Each structure stands twice: as structure tokens, then as C-alpha cells.
XYZ file of N, CA, C and O in Angstrom:
656
model
N -6.089 10.420 -11.954
C -5.701 9.892 -10.531
C -4.370 9.098 -10.829
O -4.185 8.751 -12.353
N -3.860 9.097 -9.906
C -2.470 8.343 -10.253
C -1.977 7.863 -8.587
O -3.019 8.078 -7.575
N -0.701 7.323 -8.602
C -0.734 6.672 -7.249
C -0.685 7.210 -5.841
O -0.917 6.601 -5.026
N 0.044 8.320 -6.035
C -0.028 9.268 -4.809
C -1.562 9.528 -4.339
O -1.843 9.753 -3.096
N -2.319 9.919 -5.199
C -3.632 10.303 -4.849
C -4.349 9.038 -4.317
O -5.300 9.215 -3.642
N -4.219 7.817 -5.215
C -4.949 6.720 -4.775
C -4.625 6.362 -3.159
O -5.269 5.950 -2.289
N -3.225 6.636 -2.942
C -2.733 6.093 -1.497
C -3.019 6.718 -0.755
O -3.125 6.488 0.805
N -3.086 8.082 -0.912
C -3.776 8.896 -0.074
C -5.096 8.850 0.575
O -5.327 9.299 1.810
N -5.842 8.496 -0.292
C -7.403 8.040 -0.015
C -7.237 6.660 0.889
O -7.677 7.106 2.030
N -6.471 5.925 0.587
C -6.533 4.659 1.314
C -5.914 4.749 2.569
O -6.099 4.329 3.805
N -4.869 5.575 2.922
C -4.131 5.508 3.906
C -4.491 6.952 4.773
O -4.141 6.600 5.999
N -4.582 8.232 4.355
C -5.177 9.201 4.889
C -3.570 9.928 5.349
O -2.765 9.825 5.232
N -3.942 11.219 6.216
C -3.017 11.947 6.473
C -2.814 12.430 8.118
O -3.884 12.498 8.417
N -1.789 11.900 8.824
C -1.873 12.109 10.365
C -0.705 12.629 10.605
O 0.465 12.026 10.323
N -0.757 13.893 11.468
C 0.887 14.346 11.526
C 1.164 13.938 13.066
O 2.349 14.671 13.561
N 0.260 13.248 13.646
C 0.766 12.995 15.188
C 0.790 11.343 15.206
O 0.266 10.678 14.237
N 1.688 10.859 15.684
C 1.912 9.306 15.692
C 0.698 8.637 16.249
O -0.060 9.244 16.898
N 0.286 7.511 15.630
C -0.796 6.896 15.735
C -0.926 5.328 15.437
O 0.202 5.091 15.158
N -1.915 4.813 15.932
C -1.988 3.142 15.488
C -2.319 2.684 14.489
O -3.494 3.393 14.193
N -1.703 1.723 13.842
C -2.602 1.062 12.631
C -3.864 0.331 12.628
O -4.179 0.130 13.627
N -4.233 -0.342 11.841
C -5.645 -0.982 12.080
C -4.834 -2.182 12.639
O -5.849 -2.792 13.383
N -3.557 -2.337 12.785
C -3.001 -3.393 13.204
C -2.587 -3.566 14.553
O -2.098 -4.175 15.244
N -2.654 -2.378 15.052
C -2.257 -1.950 16.465
C -0.877 -1.138 16.364
O -0.186 -0.736 17.126
N -0.389 -1.136 15.083
C 1.105 -0.479 15.143
C 1.279 1.082 14.780
O 0.163 1.752 14.185
N 2.251 1.318 15.320
C 2.558 2.550 15.411
C 3.183 3.393 14.237
O 3.989 2.871 13.506
N 2.789 4.378 13.592
C 2.532 4.819 12.293
C 2.423 6.530 12.448
O 2.077 7.252 13.404
N 2.948 6.869 11.104
C 2.785 8.658 11.053
C 2.680 8.909 9.639
O 2.816 8.067 8.990
N 2.111 10.048 9.224
C 1.750 10.349 7.973
C 1.179 9.904 7.313
O -0.169 9.731 7.703
N 1.443 9.515 5.787
C 0.534 8.638 4.971
C 1.078 7.104 4.896
O 1.758 6.793 4.293
N 0.432 6.552 6.126
C 0.751 5.080 6.264
C 2.197 4.790 6.428
O 2.642 3.598 5.920
N 2.920 5.585 7.089
C 4.479 5.295 6.989
C 4.690 4.507 8.577
O 4.609 5.119 9.641
N 4.484 3.275 8.534
C 4.840 2.623 9.740
C 6.225 2.652 10.362
O 7.137 2.633 10.188
N 6.064 2.899 11.901
C 7.155 3.289 12.427
C 8.141 2.346 13.229
O 9.268 1.575 12.997
N 7.362 1.286 13.917
C 7.799 0.305 14.495
C 6.681 -0.808 14.568
O 5.586 -0.600 14.592
N 7.149 -2.021 14.862
C 5.943 -3.128 14.916
C 5.921 -3.645 16.698
O 4.846 -4.159 17.134
N 6.589 -2.671 17.440
C 7.143 -2.850 18.811
C 6.043 -1.754 19.576
O 5.945 -0.766 19.399
N 5.631 -2.161 20.803
C 4.760 -1.865 21.711
C 4.912 -0.770 22.334
O 4.207 0.296 22.563
N 6.159 -0.035 22.400
C 6.507 1.093 22.809
C 6.444 2.428 22.105
O 7.090 2.307 21.062
N 5.822 3.372 22.895
C 5.699 4.577 21.908
C 7.073 5.219 22.180
O 7.261 5.881 21.554
N 7.680 4.895 23.319
C 9.158 5.194 23.292
C 10.191 4.880 21.986
O 10.507 5.512 21.201
N 9.806 3.547 21.727
C 10.540 3.144 20.224
C 10.250 3.606 19.277
O 10.772 4.191 18.256
N 8.923 3.898 18.912
C 8.375 4.718 17.927
C 8.540 6.116 17.607
O 9.078 6.328 16.702
N 9.052 6.689 18.911
C 9.232 8.063 18.700
C 10.822 8.247 18.583
O 11.112 9.272 17.664
N 11.519 7.175 18.787
C 13.183 7.148 18.309
C 13.317 6.925 16.835
O 14.289 7.315 16.468
N 12.452 5.967 16.481
C 12.140 5.736 15.137
C 12.109 7.102 14.125
O 12.881 6.977 13.259
N 10.904 7.550 14.687
C 10.578 8.771 14.087
C 11.713 10.071 13.935
O 11.881 10.397 12.683
N 12.376 10.174 15.020
C 13.337 11.178 14.992
C 14.668 10.701 13.804
O 15.151 11.407 13.491
N 14.834 9.283 13.647
C 15.884 8.673 12.600
C 15.243 8.941 11.639
O 16.168 9.311 10.675
N 14.033 8.807 11.245
C 13.459 9.007 10.064
C 13.515 10.336 9.491
O 13.888 10.432 8.475
N 13.530 11.477 10.439
C 13.431 12.754 10.013
C 14.482 13.783 9.878
O 14.585 14.595 9.393
N 15.245 13.272 11.005
C 16.582 13.822 11.088
C 16.133 14.791 12.312
O 17.228 16.116 12.331
N 15.568 14.878 13.281
C 15.147 15.944 14.276
C 14.653 15.177 14.986
O 14.161 13.928 15.295
N 14.475 15.983 16.419
C 13.730 16.007 17.409
C 12.318 16.227 17.133
O 11.882 17.207 17.218
N 11.287 15.228 17.047
C 10.254 15.598 16.857
C 9.094 15.663 17.558
O 7.883 16.127 17.588
N 9.430 14.717 18.522
C 8.459 14.697 20.125
C 6.991 14.039 19.216
O 5.822 14.307 19.832
N 7.246 13.151 18.493
C 5.970 12.239 18.303
C 5.113 13.388 17.169
O 3.929 12.782 16.602
N 5.581 14.327 16.265
C 4.742 15.382 15.768
C 5.905 15.776 14.629
O 6.920 16.187 14.842
N 4.950 15.629 13.264
C 5.582 16.187 11.942
C 4.825 17.313 11.233
O 3.578 17.277 11.505
N 5.206 17.981 10.536
C 4.641 18.627 9.302
C 4.548 17.861 8.405
O 4.797 16.904 7.816
N 3.519 18.559 7.331
C 2.868 18.098 6.314
C 4.106 17.796 5.343
O 4.083 16.480 4.602
N 4.620 18.669 5.000
C 6.075 18.674 4.625
C 7.104 17.248 4.778
O 7.730 16.732 3.949
N 7.344 16.968 6.016
C 7.807 15.995 6.545
C 7.085 14.478 6.395
O 7.499 13.423 5.689
N 5.523 14.659 6.193
C 4.846 13.575 6.056
C 4.911 13.274 4.144
O 4.853 12.265 3.865
N 4.944 14.526 3.260
C 5.097 13.829 1.930
C 6.241 13.257 1.661
O 6.594 12.525 0.445
N 7.253 13.594 2.272
C 8.648 13.452 1.927
C 8.708 11.830 2.036
O 9.415 11.014 1.603
N 8.370 11.655 3.407
C 8.228 10.106 3.499
C 7.560 9.139 2.940
O 7.932 8.213 2.422
N 6.229 10.010 2.175
C 5.417 9.031 1.306
C 6.282 9.098 0.198
O 6.500 8.091 -0.454
N 7.060 10.432 -0.300
C 7.630 10.047 -1.396
C 8.670 8.875 -1.636
O 8.882 8.004 -2.558
N 9.346 8.907 -0.779
C 10.428 7.537 -0.252
C 9.784 6.361 -0.139
O 10.365 5.654 -0.825
N 8.640 6.329 0.350
C 7.919 4.939 0.617
C 7.455 4.582 -0.380
O 7.673 3.048 -1.138
N 7.097 5.319 -1.669
C 6.115 4.779 -3.261
C 7.443 4.778 -3.646
O 7.297 3.682 -4.640
N 8.341 5.313 -3.990
C 9.576 5.135 -4.699
C 10.487 3.623 -4.127
O 10.616 2.703 -4.651
N 10.439 3.417 -2.997
C 10.908 1.885 -2.320
C 9.974 0.700 -2.869
O 10.374 -0.238 -3.255
N 8.509 1.293 -2.632
C 7.707 -0.209 -3.326
C 7.985 -0.205 -4.424
O 7.985 -1.415 -5.099
N 8.072 0.763 -5.597
C 7.994 0.574 -6.991
C 9.486 -0.314 -7.330
O 9.471 -1.417 -8.134
N 10.474 0.132 -6.780
C 12.032 -0.296 -6.638
C 11.802 -1.927 -5.999
O 12.420 -2.805 -6.644
N 11.122 -2.142 -5.089
C 11.054 -3.207 -4.546
C 10.311 -4.264 -5.476
O 10.772 -5.512 -5.587
N 9.468 -3.811 -5.968
C 8.683 -4.618 -7.180
C 9.463 -5.291 -8.476
O 9.629 -6.422 -8.607
N 10.217 -4.132 -8.754
C 11.206 -4.414 -9.975
C 12.493 -5.415 -9.612
O 12.836 -5.904 -10.803
N 12.709 -5.459 -8.407
C 13.994 -6.330 -8.011
C 13.453 -7.536 -7.665
O 14.282 -8.484 -7.158
N 12.035 -7.626 -7.598
C 11.688 -9.192 -7.085
C 11.290 -9.934 -8.268
O 10.472 -9.711 -9.098
N 11.609 -11.282 -7.702
C 11.418 -12.074 -9.023
C 10.251 -12.419 -9.569
O 9.940 -13.102 -10.222
N 9.381 -12.505 -8.394
C 7.830 -12.960 -8.300
C 6.979 -11.842 -8.907
O 5.952 -12.054 -9.657
N 7.678 -10.789 -8.399
C 6.725 -9.486 -8.805
C 6.905 -8.823 -10.161
O 5.738 -8.071 -10.653
N 8.235 -8.625 -10.325
C 8.602 -8.056 -11.642
C 7.536 -8.529 -12.919
O 7.184 -7.591 -13.789
N 7.823 -9.933 -12.940
C 7.204 -10.242 -14.138
C 5.519 -9.909 -14.339
O 4.853 -9.530 -15.451
N 4.750 -10.042 -12.871
C 3.428 -9.723 -13.103
C 3.279 -8.086 -13.549
O 2.402 -7.872 -14.523
N 4.335 -7.264 -12.906
C 4.048 -5.835 -13.082
C 4.617 -5.207 -14.360
O 3.563 -4.728 -15.044
N 5.348 -6.214 -15.035
C 5.651 -5.960 -16.394
C 4.481 -6.103 -17.224
O 4.451 -5.474 -18.612
N 3.662 -7.106 -17.230
C 2.636 -7.838 -17.552
C 1.413 -6.774 -17.768
O 0.504 -6.994 -18.480
N 1.154 -6.098 -16.529
C 0.133 -5.045 -16.688
C 0.205 -3.761 -17.405
O 1.240 -3.380 -17.312
N -1.042 -3.491 -17.453
C -1.309 -1.915 -17.827
C -0.911 -0.905 -16.735
O -0.881 -1.246 -15.584
N -1.186 0.640 -17.004
C -1.001 1.622 -16.311
C -1.790 1.372 -14.677
O -1.185 1.791 -13.630
N -3.365 1.425 -14.865
C -3.898 1.014 -14.145
C -3.829 0.146 -13.039
O -3.449 0.599 -11.780
N -3.711 -0.937 -13.425
C -3.691 -1.975 -12.931
C -2.178 -2.034 -12.019
O -2.065 -2.762 -10.975
N -1.260 -1.672 -12.618
C 0.151 -1.700 -12.147
C -0.059 -0.813 -10.647
O 0.924 -0.935 -9.584
N -0.894 0.366 -10.561
C -1.009 0.839 -9.661
C -1.562 0.464 -8.342
O -1.178 0.357 -7.450
N -2.555 -0.900 -8.852
C -3.167 -1.602 -7.704
C -2.159 -2.714 -7.065
O -2.135 -2.676 -5.929
N -1.360 -3.039 -7.692
C 0.159 -4.035 -7.434
C 0.715 -3.033 -6.544
O 1.373 -3.354 -5.241
N 1.362 -1.888 -6.866
C 1.981 -1.072 -5.988
C 1.333 -0.729 -4.682
O 1.871 -0.653 -3.587
N 0.008 -0.746 -4.684
C -0.914 -0.288 -3.170
C -0.633 -1.273 -2.416
O -0.553 -1.156 -1.574
N -0.867 -2.758 -3.128
C -0.697 -3.869 -1.936
C 0.389 -3.849 -1.530
O 0.716 -4.880 -0.624
N 1.582 -3.664 -2.377
C 3.074 -3.648 -1.912
C 3.533 -2.690 -0.953
O 3.956 -2.978 0.353
N 2.563 -1.531 -0.690
C 3.053 -0.521 0.058
C 2.283 -1.008 1.423
O 2.755 -0.704 2.325
N 1.187 -1.492 1.331
C 0.569 -1.932 2.536
C 0.876 -3.279 3.243
O 0.765 -3.109 4.506
N 1.460 -3.895 2.420
C 1.679 -5.302 2.934
C 3.364 -5.953 2.831
O 3.584 -6.464 3.364
N 3.864 -4.952 2.342
C 5.070 -5.410 1.843
C 5.344 -6.441 0.649
O 4.430 -7.177 0.360
N 6.536 -6.477 -0.094
C 6.728 -7.147 -1.361
C 6.869 -8.680 -0.808
O 6.090 -9.397 -1.386
N 7.205 -9.054 0.142
C 6.986 -10.242 0.768
C 5.484 -10.656 1.403
O 5.396 -11.812 0.580
N 4.688 -10.020 1.708
C 3.502 -10.314 1.681
C 2.512 -10.846 0.228
O 2.150 -11.754 0.230
N 2.932 -9.673 -0.437
C 1.891 -9.558 -1.891
C 2.766 -11.174 -2.324
O 1.981 -11.616 -3.320
N 4.157 -11.277 -2.244
C 4.578 -12.352 -3.416
C 4.000 -13.395 -2.905
O 4.338 -14.866 -3.694
N 3.440 -13.922 -1.366
C 2.803 -14.738 -1.160
C 1.615 -15.007 -1.702
O 0.813 -16.112 -1.922
N 1.188 -14.298 -2.805
C -0.234 -14.665 -2.926
C -0.090 -15.289 -4.526
O -0.454 -14.615 -5.699
N 0.719 -16.159 -4.349
C 1.073 -16.831 -5.826
C -0.293 -17.033 -6.840
O -0.041 -17.089 -8.028
N -1.352 -17.968 -6.306
C -2.147 -18.027 -7.368
C -2.913 -16.943 -8.360
O -3.340 -16.586 -9.124
N -2.973 -15.938 -7.173
C -3.669 -14.830 -7.978
C -2.965 -14.034 -8.588
O -3.189 -13.431 -9.528
N -1.269 -14.129 -8.349
C -0.459 -13.360 -9.106
C -0.442 -14.224 -10.735
O -0.451 -13.393 -11.846
N -0.195 -15.203 -10.889
C -0.335 -16.106 -11.833
C -1.494 -15.701 -13.005
O -1.785 -15.656 -13.667
N -2.697 -15.692 -11.794
C -4.264 -15.184 -12.717
C -4.179 -13.776 -13.458
O -4.777 -13.461 -14.284
N -3.512 -12.649 -12.821
C -3.330 -11.635 -13.067
C -2.335 -11.619 -14.463
O -2.552 -10.841 -15.380
N -1.176 -12.620 -14.223
C -0.551 -12.298 -15.276
C -1.085 -12.848 -16.546
O -0.976 -12.342 -17.836
N -2.046 -13.892 -16.398
C -2.920 -14.566 -17.315
C -3.913 -13.394 -17.835
O -4.842 -14.146 -18.690
N -3.931 -12.456 -17.032
C -5.256 -11.484 -17.533
C -6.689 -12.233 -17.232
O -7.668 -11.715 -18.103
N -6.678 -12.827 -16.433
C -8.086 -13.581 -15.691
C -8.395 -12.647 -14.586
O -8.624 -13.235 -13.556
N -8.895 -11.710 -14.959
C -9.449 -10.446 -14.086
C -10.668 -10.956 -13.070
O -10.496 -10.587 -11.610
N -11.426 -11.578 -13.487
C -12.698 -12.040 -12.776
C -12.322 -12.982 -11.909
O -12.656 -12.961 -10.652
N -11.491 -14.031 -12.237
C -11.031 -15.308 -11.341
C -9.945 -14.768 -10.245
O -10.249 -15.296 -9.132
N -9.208 -13.696 -10.661
C -8.363 -13.053 -9.991
C -8.917 -12.290 -8.818
O -8.535 -12.235 -7.356
N -9.699 -11.569 -9.130
C -10.553 -10.921 -8.015
C -11.222 -11.755 -6.854
O -11.342 -11.590 -5.640
N -11.987 -12.952 -7.573
C -12.311 -13.885 -6.475
C -11.261 -14.525 -5.584
O -11.675 -14.447 -4.183
N -10.326 -15.065 -6.085
C -9.101 -15.822 -5.701
C -8.617 -14.355 -4.300
O -8.208 -14.660 -3.423
N -8.577 -13.105 -4.342
C -7.484 -12.120 -4.041
C -8.635 -12.103 -2.520
O -8.031 -11.625 -1.506
N -10.067 -12.014 -2.830
C -10.838 -11.971 -1.807
C -10.985 -12.863 -0.432
O -11.444 -12.695 0.672
N -10.205 -13.975 -0.861
C -9.896 -15.089 0.053
C -8.724 -15.252 0.673
O -7.956 -15.780 0.803
N -8.664 -13.897 1.356
C -7.513 -13.718 2.112
C -7.766 -12.663 3.553
O -8.960 -12.441 3.677
N -6.836 -12.832 4.341
C -6.522 -12.351 5.810
C -6.948 -10.743 5.568
O -7.764 -9.967 6.015
N -6.289 -10.695 4.481
C -6.114 -8.958 4.202
C -7.531 -8.595 3.530
O -7.968 -7.449 4.133
N -8.270 -9.014 3.356
C -9.748 -8.815 2.449
C -10.789 -8.720 3.649
O -11.524 -7.772 4.424
N -10.626 -9.880 4.609
C -11.259 -9.965 5.858
C -10.940 -8.905 6.896
O -12.031 -8.309 7.566
N -9.929 -8.563 6.993
C -9.200 -7.248 7.835
C -9.452 -5.967 7.664
O -9.987 -4.766 8.197
N -9.520 -5.659 6.308
C -9.354 -4.176 5.706
C -10.133 -4.112 4.427
O -9.635 -3.896 3.394
N -11.870 -4.761 5.012
C -12.656 -4.891 3.569
C -12.852 -4.061 2.375
O -12.962 -4.134 1.323
N -13.239 -2.740 3.065
C -13.218 -1.580 1.810
C -12.391 -1.354 1.238
O -12.529 -1.019 -0.066
N -11.147 -0.855 1.949
C -9.735 -0.944 1.038
C -10.021 -2.125 0.207
O -9.272 -1.602 -0.732
N -9.735 -3.252 0.496
C -9.483 -4.526 -0.347
C -10.356 -4.468 -1.542
O -10.125 -4.574 -2.631
N -11.361 -3.827 -0.984
C -12.222 -3.767 -2.334
C -12.279 -3.152 -3.530
O -12.446 -3.206 -4.707
N -11.506 -1.701 -3.198
C -11.413 -0.695 -3.952
C -10.255 -1.403 -4.749
O -10.175 -1.349 -6.096
N -9.497 -2.072 -4.094
C -8.094 -2.298 -5.114
C -8.423 -3.811 -5.862
O -7.882 -3.946 -6.916
N -9.169 -4.288 -5.312
C -9.724 -5.507 -6.376
C -10.647 -5.357 -7.709
O -10.368 -5.606 -8.465
N -11.589 -4.140 -7.207
C -12.153 -3.458 -8.277
C -11.440 -3.333 -9.327
O -11.538 -3.161 -10.470
N -10.298 -2.194 -8.717
C -9.296 -1.672 -9.744
C -8.594 -2.719 -10.566
O -8.260 -2.516 -11.803
N -8.378 -3.829 -10.022
C -7.631 -4.986 -10.813
C -8.691 -5.577 -11.758
O -8.380 -6.148 -12.980
N -9.833 -5.665 -11.322
C -10.923 -6.100 -12.415
C -11.333 -5.612 -13.458
O -11.676 -5.836 -14.471
N -11.298 -4.280 -13.079
C -12.121 -3.196 -14.166
C -10.820 -2.495 -15.261
O -10.970 -2.066 -16.220
N -9.699 -2.425 -14.361
C -8.497 -1.531 -15.404
C -8.857 -0.293 -15.136
O -8.375 0.654 -15.927
N -10.154 0.546 -14.425
C -10.245 2.025 -14.403
C -10.039 2.474 -13.056
O -10.277 1.858 -12.087
N -10.204 3.706 -13.134
C -10.498 4.253 -11.501
C -11.882 4.262 -10.906
O -11.723 5.147 -9.860
N -12.531 3.826 -11.167
C -14.170 4.044 -10.744
C -14.195 3.888 -9.253
O -15.217 4.412 -8.465
N -13.460 3.003 -8.679
C -13.813 2.658 -7.153
C -13.187 3.824 -6.491
O -13.375 3.887 -4.865
N -12.417 4.741 -6.900
C -11.827 5.934 -6.517
C -12.421 7.127 -6.453
O -11.937 8.318 -5.932
N -13.582 7.391 -7.573
C -14.374 8.240 -7.974
C -15.410 8.802 -6.943
O -15.466 9.751 -6.748
N -15.884 7.582 -6.602
C -16.489 7.893 -5.198
C -15.861 8.602 -4.296
O -16.135 9.907 -4.147
N -14.910 8.085 -3.658
C -14.006 8.680 -2.617
C -13.339 9.895 -3.485
O -11.914 9.831 -3.087
């Protein structure tokens, strides 16, 4: 299992503009287009993102291209971030994927706000950090996904994703 397979389990694939769990306009593999309520603003962002007139619909190909960019940007964002970088560097390969997943879903900023959990992951206090991470809007709003990510940080292996 790798970062791409993991994220694709968590996000799914949709070739037509759709709404987030949050109500936001998205397409592909969890590629947020706009936080704006107009389908029209969304369509315009889409065409800007793809470089063609899409009419709200993309190919598999375009979906994966957006996904490759998004994953690359998540990793780079982690590496550029003073709060995230040290935790990332301290982690093993599997747990590194769990942090990338959080950043993809919630952005650098959002994750950098989980101060206490970050501290615990650095210290390698896996059980404590899993309990702390669960105490969040994130967990309450998307509990099945948060629990997969959380188990991943807890165990250091891919079992949460075996099932799936």
C-alpha cells in the first residue's frame, strides 16, 4: 500500500463536479475547487485547473493528473512548514503517510493547529496521541476516515486499509 492507494480509498473518484462532506464543490480524487456556493464559480475554477472547457466533467486521466499535483503539494507543504517538518522527519514511512493524508484533507494550516497531538507523535507516544487526535471536529465530522488515519498512527502498519 502507498500514499496514492491510501488516499484513493479515503477520497474516492468522481468525474463530475460534486459536493464535499462539507458542501464544497470538488472533483476527481478529493480536489477541492472552490468554497463558494456557485456552481458557476466552480466550473470556472475547473476549466482554469485543467486548461480546457470542461463543462463540469473531466476524464480519469485529468483526475489522476490533479491527484499527482495535490499529493506533491501536500508533501512540499509539510517540508516547508516549521511546525510539520520536524514531526514528518521523526516518523517512520507508514506514519508519514498518515500525516500526509491529514494535510491533503485539511491543509497545512489546519494540521499545524493540532499542537498537542503533533508533540505526542514526535515523542512516539502512539496511544496517547490517538486519544488526543479523536478529540476534534475532524473526528466527529468524518469518523470512519479519521479512525483509519488514527489507527495508522497508532500501529504503524496498514491494517485499517486491508479491510477496505
